[PDB]
Amino acid sequence: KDSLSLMAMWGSIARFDPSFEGPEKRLEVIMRVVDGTHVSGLLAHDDDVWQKVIDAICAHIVSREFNEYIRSYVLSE
Amino acid sequence: XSLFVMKDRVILITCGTITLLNCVPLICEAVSTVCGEVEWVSFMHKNYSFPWEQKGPHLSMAEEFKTLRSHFPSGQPFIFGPIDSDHYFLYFHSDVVQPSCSDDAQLSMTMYGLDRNQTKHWYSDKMLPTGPETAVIREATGLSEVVDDSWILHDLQYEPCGYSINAIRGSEYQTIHITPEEHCSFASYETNTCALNYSKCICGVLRVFDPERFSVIVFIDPDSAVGKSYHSGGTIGVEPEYYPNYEAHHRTVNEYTPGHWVLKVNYVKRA
Amino acid sequence: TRINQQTECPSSVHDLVSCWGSTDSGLEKRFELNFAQPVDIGTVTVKQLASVMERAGESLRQNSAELGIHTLKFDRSLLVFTAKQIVVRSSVSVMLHEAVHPMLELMRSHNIIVDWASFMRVNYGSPWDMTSETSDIMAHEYAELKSAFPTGHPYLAGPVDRDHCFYFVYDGIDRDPSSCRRENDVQINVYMYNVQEQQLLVSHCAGEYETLRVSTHPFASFETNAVSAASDITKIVNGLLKKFYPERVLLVLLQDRDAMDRLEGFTVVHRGANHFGGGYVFHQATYARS
Ligand SMILES: NC(=[NH2+])c1cccc(/C=N/N/C(N)=[NH+]/N=C/c2cccc(C(N)=[NH2+])c2)c1
């Protein structure tokens, strides 16, 4: 492995004790609006679209809440 | 974990060993269907506590870098903080052809070694969606103060342990995820709330968990409220004065892209 | 196409490197020690410093003695020794990490306490370029450094895939109110990539110096710890850019416990700062010719 990941591993080893991974991965994608962009943007899609996205990572939606600005989904492995 | 879909973006938060980057092709497709154009992509994660168990591209920062480079060749990786201790890995891609106004906000917290009296309430022998049972947990631990009645919330108590909650109020959101095991105690908090000072927001979370150590990272946009305050010598709520029981161990400041800044601080509780 | 291999956790950093671990792409390495108490200029001999650098494959060629400064010039490295610090800068073909432990033993034999140390390398290429040995060397550098300073930590200032500084810092400075260990050091570093061979030191004051290394793609490396330099970083860098006219530039400025916006004809690539728990800050900015 690379030296930087090697250093990060040693720091984790020194804090290891015989374990679930709490620290999270975060992905954010922001799109530009053009003349032909849907007036609702990404909110135009239905939950079908976002469920297929979660399937790509081998997870599923457990609950849903939406408002006029944001769609919120809880996920579980 | 959490998926926050807004008018102009997606925010996907995952934990465990989920291979988050596999969904990039469909996100790109989701943007092309509504006739949008990707202009800004960020991949970020606190250093993993057990990197030897991550799979796919996430087994090493070189693999995450190479994977993201195969899709976003102009992106740039960064590492903020001590590499053999608490730090963040960031990959940032931007294709901003039309200058715009950046007034967003992002506040993330990573907490370890959680209060032992509190971890009791994050355990359960049965699965419990948002209902009367979780309401007891939110009051019994203090999450009610962080997520008051003005927020639309929906949480989940896991079996045998584990807790997640999402909250939304207008265009703002709020999320928390808890791992209460004693030997790997961890809790996370993130929000995009606009605030001239995050001290009360942060302290509210610390009151719930009171962790042995924690890190806070703040992305500052130039045209945001916190941005104007930060760029005018003003305090933003992450300074050491707001945490007398904690000692700042290392702090980083980076203008990762022109006009945009990120601040990270590691705090360790004093004896 | 991976399986799980139940294996032992390395008991030391050295076991982790050997077990779980083009030429070096860096441009310069820098190794520094500071002392809990100032050292008599003459207690550490030129012979002893030279035997340490033999462990890194360097042979002494020239050395001069001045007021508060001892300068040792090797084939590919320059060593400055004052009452407050030892600083050696070398090319990347020098395995400078091999001098860490011998140098510490030498200080130990003289009853000299090291309470602060740094190892720094300036890279143009990424450590994730698997066709290069940069990653294997950095892993060995980390082994020696972390082995000697378990409390030290590595840091990466700047874009990993562009001009950046990887450095390792150990801070064991005694900061009890009753301590006489003040921290008002000046450190200013100017790295100039692709300029248009020598190792020089100019001394204007006792214990304060300016060093310049020119090597190879030609690059020049300037350093100074002069208090007068801290009051006008703007002037000195402009004089360097005129004399060398590089394509890219990397600046590092020390803001010690007891205490860069634009360069002429250069656009800012990255700007950042590392604020250490000890109160001091390392500022860094990289630039590219417009
Ligand atoms: N929303 C999320 N994706 C989320 C958020 C926060 C924590 C967790 C993890 N819960 N699980 C924890 N903390 N511990 N592990 C529990 C466990 C123990 C034995 C077996 C299993 C299992 N279902 N295989 C789980 C999951």
XYZ file of C-alpha atoms and ligand atoms in Angstrom:
664
model
C 0.000 0.000 0.000
C 0.958 3.663 -0.251
C 2.984 5.331 2.486
C 0.238 7.793 3.445
C -2.332 5.031 3.940
C 0.371 3.092 5.792
C 0.744 5.973 8.254
C -3.024 6.205 8.706
C -3.127 2.472 9.437
C -0.452 2.626 12.143
C -2.413 5.373 13.877
C -5.476 3.124 13.821
C -3.492 0.113 15.057
C -2.230 2.025 18.099
C -5.888 2.735 18.967
C -7.131 -0.804 18.241
C -8.554 -3.118 20.909
C -9.951 -6.631 20.305
C -15.845 -3.323 15.798
C -18.073 -1.232 13.523
C -16.856 1.600 11.285
C -18.488 4.760 12.604
C -16.553 7.317 10.549
C -18.511 8.011 7.387
C -17.958 8.580 3.690
C -19.541 11.701 2.196
C -20.333 12.348 -1.470
C -21.747 15.647 -2.732
C -22.657 16.511 -6.329
C -23.926 19.969 -7.314
C -25.252 20.518 -10.841
C -25.470 23.633 -12.993
C -28.807 24.950 -14.213
C -29.155 25.569 -17.951
C -32.057 26.886 -20.022
C -33.527 23.399 -20.424
C -33.080 22.298 -16.808
C -36.191 20.967 -15.099
C -37.718 23.736 -12.986
C -37.697 21.276 -10.066
C -34.084 20.231 -10.655
C -33.197 16.888 -9.109
C -36.468 16.950 -7.143
C -38.228 16.092 -10.418
C -37.191 12.460 -9.953
C -39.387 10.103 -7.958
C -38.179 7.788 -5.204
C -37.706 5.123 -7.894
C -34.617 6.964 -9.153
C -32.986 7.346 -5.742
C -33.766 3.752 -4.742
C -31.819 2.448 -7.747
C -28.912 4.674 -6.688
C -28.894 3.170 -3.190
C -28.977 -0.316 -4.727
C -25.677 0.394 -6.502
C -24.031 0.554 -3.056
C -25.923 -2.485 -1.679
C -28.146 -0.590 0.768
C -31.838 0.251 1.040
C -34.130 3.028 2.234
C -35.870 2.573 5.581
C -37.878 5.820 5.846
C -38.611 8.954 3.838
C -39.393 12.586 4.594
C -39.673 15.430 2.094
C -40.520 19.112 2.013
C -40.615 21.842 -0.619
C -36.799 22.059 -0.761
C -35.236 18.739 0.235
C -35.873 14.991 0.175
C -34.478 13.113 3.177
C -33.809 9.369 3.250
C -32.513 7.140 6.037
C -30.377 4.252 4.805
C -29.211 0.953 6.268
C -26.790 -1.739 5.115
C -26.323 6.433 6.281
C -28.239 9.384 4.824
C -29.319 10.666 1.410
C -30.272 14.336 1.091
C -31.688 15.263 -2.323
C -32.166 18.971 -2.997
C -33.069 21.076 -6.016
C -29.449 21.431 -7.145
C -27.418 18.696 -5.439
C -27.181 15.306 -3.762
C -25.505 14.559 -0.425
C -24.885 10.861 0.217
C -23.511 9.868 3.633
C -22.613 6.245 4.331
C -20.785 4.338 7.055
C -19.496 0.824 7.653
C -17.928 -0.788 4.600
C -20.464 0.485 2.044
C -18.664 1.212 -1.236
C -20.081 4.697 -1.681
C -18.345 5.549 -4.961
C -20.188 2.844 -6.931
C -23.229 5.116 -7.325
C -21.406 7.923 -9.176
C -22.515 6.761 -12.671
C -26.197 6.839 -11.680
C -25.844 10.241 -9.995
C -24.343 11.600 -13.215
C -27.266 10.047 -15.089
C -29.715 11.522 -12.571
C -28.297 14.953 -13.420
C -28.475 14.469 -17.202
C -32.125 13.352 -17.172
C -33.293 16.679 -15.706
C -30.869 18.403 -18.109
C -28.331 19.515 -15.512
C -24.547 19.744 -15.678
C -22.192 18.583 -12.933
C -20.077 21.519 -11.742
C -18.949 20.511 -8.254
C -18.093 17.119 -6.767
C -16.541 16.476 -3.359
C -15.651 13.158 -1.748
C -14.682 13.326 1.907
C -14.252 11.095 4.922
C -12.729 11.211 8.368
C -9.848 8.772 8.671
C -11.197 5.248 9.080
C -10.825 3.600 12.475
C -10.328 0.175 10.821
C -8.931 0.839 7.334
C -7.876 -2.792 6.831
C -11.567 -3.779 6.559
C -12.616 -1.286 3.870
C -13.336 -2.805 0.465
C -13.190 -1.815 -3.178
C -11.592 1.580 -3.822
C -11.744 2.515 -0.122
C -8.995 0.173 1.118
C -6.462 2.975 0.578
C -6.461 6.690 -0.162
C -4.528 5.911 -3.347
C -7.393 3.680 -4.502
C -10.008 6.321 -3.667
C -7.866 8.862 -5.531
C -7.381 6.660 -8.602
C -11.075 5.732 -8.674
C -12.213 9.349 -8.477
C -9.582 10.367 -11.037
C -11.039 7.875 -13.533
C -14.281 9.909 -13.472
C -13.104 13.437 -12.558
C -9.558 13.761 -13.928
C -9.058 17.381 -12.840
C -10.006 16.717 -9.213
C -7.446 17.273 -6.477
C -6.923 15.319 -3.228
C -6.095 16.848 0.142
C -5.326 15.534 3.622
C -6.028 17.858 6.566
C -4.348 17.030 9.862
C -2.048 14.391 11.338
C -1.976 11.426 8.991
C -1.376 8.895 11.790
C -4.125 10.473 13.924
C -7.400 12.365 13.450
C -7.575 13.824 9.943
C -9.761 14.182 6.853
C -9.273 13.016 3.272
C -10.837 15.247 0.615
C -11.136 14.928 -3.156
C -12.454 18.068 -4.854
C -13.534 18.519 -8.478
C -15.061 21.678 -9.933
C -16.037 22.768 -13.443
C -17.441 26.227 -12.681
C -17.590 27.949 -16.074
C -20.091 30.636 -15.001
C -19.023 32.520 -11.844
C -21.812 32.384 -9.273
C -22.599 33.290 -5.658
C -21.503 30.749 -3.032
C -23.468 31.196 0.206
C -23.805 27.597 1.434
C -22.553 26.268 4.763
C -21.318 22.901 6.001
C -20.503 21.877 9.577
C -19.367 18.319 10.312
C -18.417 16.789 13.662
C -16.741 13.484 14.502
C -16.834 12.350 18.133
C -15.177 9.375 19.836
C -15.394 7.841 23.291
C -19.019 8.658 24.042
C -20.598 9.112 27.463
C -21.177 5.728 29.089
C -24.437 6.796 30.749
C -25.674 7.771 27.271
C -24.631 4.665 25.311
C -27.209 2.767 27.384
C -30.027 4.457 25.449
C -28.603 3.689 21.984
C -29.088 -0.060 22.585
C -32.210 -2.054 21.766
C -33.093 -5.706 21.169
C -35.620 -4.790 18.458
C -35.805 -2.536 15.411
C -37.678 0.720 16.072
C -38.508 3.238 13.319
C -39.642 6.752 14.238
C -42.251 6.234 16.942
C -43.034 6.737 20.628
C -40.069 4.557 21.629
C -37.496 6.745 19.875
C -39.114 9.866 21.343
C -38.189 8.463 24.761
C -34.605 8.029 23.558
C -34.412 11.598 22.246
C -35.610 13.012 25.575
C -33.636 10.523 27.681
C -30.366 11.525 25.962
C -30.867 15.173 24.954
C -31.382 14.912 21.187
C -34.666 16.785 21.691
C -32.671 19.953 22.384
C -30.592 19.530 19.220
C -33.673 18.602 17.155
C -36.584 20.574 18.612
C -40.218 20.612 17.464
C -39.475 23.002 14.578
C -37.717 20.187 12.667
C -39.233 17.328 10.681
C -37.350 14.316 12.047
C -37.337 10.580 11.407
C -34.902 8.295 13.229
C -34.162 4.588 13.609
C -32.960 2.621 16.636
C -30.910 -0.355 15.461
C -30.601 -3.863 16.873
C -28.624 -4.699 18.941
C -27.238 -1.143 18.918
C -26.935 1.882 16.659
C -28.958 5.061 16.129
C -29.606 7.330 13.147
C -31.710 10.464 12.736
C -32.415 12.897 9.908
C -33.948 16.335 10.453
C -35.065 18.962 7.937
C -36.455 22.487 8.286
C -37.039 24.422 5.084
C -33.864 24.090 3.017
C -31.681 23.224 6.030
C -30.950 19.693 7.227
C -29.448 17.950 10.242
C -28.186 14.389 10.669
C -26.656 12.305 13.459
C -25.352 8.730 13.493
C -24.205 6.939 16.645
C -22.079 3.833 17.247
C -22.284 3.179 21.013
C -20.007 0.139 21.483
C -17.604 0.935 24.314
C -14.476 -0.261 22.499
C -15.254 1.751 19.325
C -17.547 4.521 20.555
C -18.279 7.047 17.805
C -20.886 9.669 16.932
C -21.256 12.001 13.949
C -23.097 15.260 13.335
C -23.573 17.292 10.173
C -25.701 20.260 9.151
C -25.863 22.965 6.488
C -27.409 25.583 8.772
C -26.501 29.221 8.284
C -25.206 30.723 11.522
C -22.810 33.519 12.438
C -21.454 31.335 15.268
C -21.552 27.544 15.607
C -20.576 27.454 19.299
C -24.111 26.875 20.590
C -24.813 24.342 17.839
C -21.569 22.492 18.592
C -21.931 22.734 22.375
C -25.476 21.405 22.079
C -24.096 18.281 20.410
C -21.238 17.983 22.910
C -23.721 18.116 25.798
C -25.377 14.980 24.408
C -22.173 12.989 23.903
C -19.428 14.724 25.934
C -16.743 12.820 23.993
C -13.154 12.186 25.005
C -12.104 13.789 21.715
C -13.774 15.212 18.632
C -12.997 16.948 15.350
C -14.969 19.755 13.705
C -14.512 20.775 10.065
C -16.111 23.908 8.603
C -16.383 24.712 4.899
C -16.642 28.481 4.432
C -18.082 29.978 1.264
C -17.163 33.573 0.369
C -20.727 34.923 0.090
C -22.226 33.222 3.166
C -23.026 34.803 6.521
C -20.279 32.842 8.279
C -18.051 33.696 5.316
C -18.379 37.445 5.802
C -17.828 36.998 9.545
C -14.748 34.804 9.087
C -13.199 37.114 6.477
C -13.637 40.105 8.835
C -11.751 38.796 11.870
C -14.949 37.570 13.501
C -15.311 34.441 15.592
C -17.280 31.593 14.019
C -17.810 29.284 17.012
C -14.911 26.813 16.675
C -12.312 28.793 18.633
C -10.790 27.202 21.758
C -12.485 29.684 24.100
C -15.873 28.014 23.544
C -14.560 24.660 24.867
C -12.782 25.173 28.202
C -12.931 21.466 29.091
C -11.207 20.637 25.776
C -7.663 21.266 24.556
C -7.028 22.004 20.888
C -4.372 19.623 19.559
C -4.082 20.563 15.877
C -5.836 22.953 13.513
C -5.694 23.402 9.737
C -6.797 26.167 7.366
C -6.881 25.639 3.598
C -8.155 27.565 0.589
C -8.692 24.369 -1.373
C -10.201 26.323 -4.282
C -10.118 30.081 -4.953
C -12.421 31.977 -2.619
C -13.427 28.862 -0.643
C -11.866 27.840 2.666
C -12.039 24.903 5.065
C -11.167 24.877 8.775
C -10.520 21.722 10.795
C -9.758 21.441 14.514
C -9.037 18.406 16.695
C -10.116 18.704 20.342
C -9.049 16.361 23.144
C -10.677 16.458 26.567
C -8.447 17.570 29.427
C -7.795 15.452 32.510
C -10.828 -10.311 -6.281
C -9.786 -10.102 -2.621
C -10.041 -12.363 0.420
C -9.550 -11.760 4.135
C -6.148 -12.674 5.594
C -6.288 -13.056 9.371
C -2.854 -11.707 10.329
C -1.101 -10.066 13.259
C -0.953 -6.346 13.912
C 2.639 -5.094 13.520
C 4.101 -4.421 16.953
C 6.208 -1.543 15.592
C 6.274 0.844 12.653
C 9.194 -1.120 11.196
C 7.177 -4.350 11.100
C 4.289 -2.498 9.436
C 6.543 -1.185 6.656
C 8.276 -4.443 5.732
C 5.147 -6.586 6.129
C 2.291 -4.392 4.863
C 4.413 -2.186 2.579
C 11.328 5.869 -11.706
C 13.269 7.261 -8.748
C 12.305 9.502 -5.831
C 10.238 12.399 -7.170
C 10.951 14.863 -4.363
C 13.270 17.843 -4.770
C 14.793 18.344 -1.312
C 14.820 16.814 2.164
C 15.281 18.761 5.398
C 16.015 17.429 8.895
C 16.015 19.656 11.976
C 16.575 19.219 15.713
C 16.030 21.814 18.436
C 17.369 21.539 21.969
C 15.831 22.039 25.401
C 18.878 24.189 26.226
C 21.333 25.982 23.915
C 24.467 23.983 23.128
C 28.078 25.130 23.315
C 29.058 25.740 19.691
C 32.166 23.588 20.083
C 31.006 20.672 22.240
C 29.781 18.756 19.169
C 32.748 18.313 16.844
C 32.898 18.377 13.059
C 34.142 14.777 13.175
C 31.101 13.549 15.098
C 28.640 15.348 12.813
C 30.459 13.869 9.814
C 30.293 10.298 11.126
C 26.525 10.734 11.506
C 26.193 11.827 7.879
C 28.266 8.823 6.797
C 25.276 6.721 7.872
C 23.328 8.561 5.141
C 25.991 8.044 2.463
C 27.501 11.546 2.586
C 31.182 12.466 2.896
C 32.465 15.768 4.252
C 34.082 17.990 1.615
C 34.274 21.450 3.209
C 33.445 23.104 6.514
C 33.744 26.634 7.884
C 33.531 28.053 11.406
C 31.915 31.422 12.112
C 30.362 33.347 14.993
C 27.668 31.040 16.342
C 27.569 28.862 13.207
C 29.298 25.710 11.976
C 28.742 24.905 8.293
C 29.431 21.430 6.889
C 29.215 20.893 3.126
C 28.846 17.394 1.685
C 28.383 16.102 -1.860
C 24.584 16.455 -1.843
C 23.776 18.048 1.526
C 24.436 21.166 3.599
C 24.522 21.089 7.409
C 24.233 24.161 9.646
C 24.876 23.851 13.391
C 24.082 26.674 15.830
C 23.532 26.855 19.579
C 19.773 26.429 19.053
C 19.416 23.924 16.209
C 20.958 21.494 13.748
C 19.592 21.757 10.202
C 20.701 19.616 7.254
C 19.224 20.033 3.767
C 19.994 17.478 1.071
C 19.050 16.245 -2.366
C 16.541 13.413 -2.604
C 19.126 10.783 -3.555
C 20.370 11.136 0.040
C 18.684 8.714 2.453
C 18.578 11.406 5.116
C 16.247 9.346 7.314
C 19.240 7.062 7.940
C 20.906 9.897 9.902
C 17.979 10.451 12.296
C 18.864 7.789 14.864
C 22.668 8.304 14.704
C 22.174 12.062 15.074
C 19.917 11.488 18.088
C 22.490 9.125 19.606
C 25.156 11.803 19.146
C 22.999 14.339 20.990
C 22.382 11.658 23.620
C 26.111 11.034 24.096
C 26.580 14.771 24.775
C 23.665 14.911 27.255
C 21.762 17.140 24.805
C 17.976 16.893 25.073
C 16.078 17.183 21.796
C 12.640 18.656 22.507
C 11.586 19.521 18.935
C 12.407 17.962 15.572
C 11.185 18.064 11.990
C 11.731 16.123 8.780
C 10.482 17.795 5.612
C 10.440 16.940 1.920
C 9.205 19.061 -0.982
C 7.553 16.950 -3.682
C 6.567 17.764 -7.249
C 5.077 14.336 -7.957
C 2.488 12.456 -5.966
C 3.473 9.662 -3.553
C 0.678 7.636 -5.184
C 2.614 7.275 -8.459
C 3.291 3.539 -8.237
C 5.941 3.658 -10.981
C 8.151 5.602 -8.536
C 9.968 4.722 -5.320
C 8.746 7.872 -3.532
C 6.193 5.917 -1.496
C 8.658 3.238 -0.373
C 11.140 5.888 0.784
C 8.516 7.922 2.649
C 7.463 4.723 4.425
C 11.058 4.142 5.536
C 11.385 7.803 6.533
C 8.222 7.388 8.610
C 9.610 4.234 10.230
C 12.771 5.990 11.432
C 10.957 9.174 12.461
C 8.019 7.542 14.245
C 10.369 4.969 15.788
C 12.480 7.773 17.261
C 9.546 10.104 18.057
C 6.434 8.032 18.836
C 4.752 11.316 19.806
C 5.659 12.987 16.507
C 3.201 13.097 13.626
C 3.328 13.445 9.826
C 1.488 16.137 7.889
C 0.867 16.902 4.218
C 0.525 20.614 3.420
C -0.959 21.295 -0.001
C -2.434 19.254 -2.847
C -1.198 15.670 -2.731
C -1.024 15.583 -6.545
C 0.709 18.962 -6.990
C 3.438 20.949 -5.253
C 3.234 20.169 -1.546
C 5.303 19.661 1.592
C 5.252 16.423 3.545
C 6.758 16.953 6.982
C 6.959 15.114 10.292
C 6.949 17.139 13.517
C 7.790 16.021 17.047
C 7.001 18.576 19.767
C 8.281 17.735 23.235
C 8.863 21.342 24.270
C 8.407 21.828 28.016
C 5.842 24.638 28.285
C 5.389 24.699 32.054
C 5.079 28.330 33.250
C 8.419 27.896 35.057
C 10.243 26.924 31.840
C 12.801 29.163 30.132
C 12.224 27.617 26.676
C 11.102 30.584 24.597
C 9.795 30.168 21.036
C 10.540 33.180 18.823
C 12.261 31.418 15.935
C 12.101 32.677 12.356
C 11.985 30.155 9.516
C 11.329 31.206 5.915
C 11.747 28.762 3.021
C 11.539 29.597 -0.692
C 11.533 26.718 -3.187
C 11.839 27.652 -6.862
C 10.988 25.016 -9.473
C 12.468 25.092 -12.985
C 14.746 28.109 -12.735
C 16.423 29.764 -15.720
C 25.083 23.719 -8.863
C 26.213 25.165 -5.533
C 25.618 25.157 -1.778
C 26.149 28.522 -0.094
C 25.718 30.062 3.342
C 25.855 33.785 4.116
C 26.005 34.949 7.738
C 25.018 38.524 8.591
C 24.497 38.080 12.349
C 25.580 35.657 15.057
C 23.473 32.500 14.909
C 21.403 33.848 11.993
C 22.071 32.710 8.443
C 20.865 32.493 4.865
C 21.441 29.269 2.926
C 20.964 28.667 -0.791
C 21.096 25.323 -2.599
C 20.980 25.018 -6.391
C 20.633 21.546 -7.901
C 18.483 19.504 -10.297
C 15.038 20.206 -14.077
C 16.918 22.965 -12.221
C 15.599 24.153 -8.871
C 16.858 26.546 -6.205
C 16.168 26.339 -2.470
C 16.481 29.338 -0.139
C 16.220 29.327 3.653
C 16.791 31.878 6.393
C 16.196 32.175 10.134
C 17.124 35.860 10.388
C 14.845 38.042 12.502
C 15.330 40.796 9.915
C 13.918 38.498 7.222
C 10.654 38.044 9.143
C 9.936 41.787 8.857
C 10.136 41.903 5.043
C 9.489 38.535 3.402
C 8.140 40.485 0.415
C 11.499 42.000 -0.528
C 13.620 38.849 -0.330
C 11.288 36.677 -2.423
C 11.072 39.290 -5.185
C 14.864 39.364 -5.351
C 14.885 35.574 -5.596
C 12.249 35.409 -8.341
C 14.133 37.994 -10.399
C 17.488 36.222 -10.097
C 16.016 32.766 -10.800
C 12.708 33.387 -12.628
C 11.024 30.036 -11.863
C 7.848 28.522 -13.263
C 6.472 27.480 -9.855
C 7.209 28.600 -6.299
C 6.530 27.162 -2.842
C 6.817 29.353 0.257
C 6.845 28.270 3.900
C 6.789 30.796 6.749
C 7.078 29.971 10.445
C 4.875 31.880 12.895
C 6.330 30.820 16.226
C 4.463 30.776 19.531
C 5.997 34.187 20.317
C 5.148 35.983 17.076
C 2.016 35.624 0.856
C -1.182 37.084 -0.601
C 0.167 37.705 -4.116
C 3.445 37.406 -6.017
C 4.469 39.413 -9.066
C 3.574 37.533 -12.239
C 2.389 34.469 -10.309
C -1.081 33.063 -9.686
C -1.885 31.360 -6.385
C -2.252 27.585 -6.719
C -2.850 26.713 -3.061
C -2.716 28.473 0.300
C -2.975 26.938 3.756
C -1.699 26.840 7.310
C -0.936 24.198 9.949
C -1.573 25.494 13.476
C 0.179 23.171 15.917
C -1.076 22.608 19.445
C 2.098 24.241 20.749
C 0.816 27.601 19.490
C 3.091 27.983 16.458
C 1.901 27.963 12.846
C 3.440 26.869 9.538
C 2.077 28.909 6.621
C 2.408 27.611 3.067
C 1.457 28.867 -0.384
C 2.238 27.568 -3.868
C 2.297 29.647 -7.037
C 2.572 29.127 -10.782
C 3.802 31.644 -13.334
C 0.915 33.353 -15.112
N -27.739 4.512 9.347
C -26.719 3.790 9.383
N -26.248 3.164 8.162
C -25.984 3.613 10.710
C -25.736 4.745 11.467
C -25.078 4.644 12.678
C -24.665 3.406 13.133
C -24.914 2.265 12.389
C -24.417 0.932 12.946
N -25.073 0.257 13.769
N -24.474 -0.943 14.219
C -23.676 -0.851 15.179
N -23.426 0.437 15.800
N -22.989 -1.996 15.743
N -23.136 -3.311 15.255
C -24.146 -3.990 15.541
C -24.255 -5.422 15.023
C -23.769 -6.440 15.825
C -23.839 -7.756 15.402
C -24.396 -8.052 14.171
C -24.886 -7.035 13.366
C -25.484 -7.405 12.010
N -26.782 -6.909 11.592
N -24.842 -8.163 11.250
C -24.809 -5.712 13.786
C -25.571 2.365 11.166
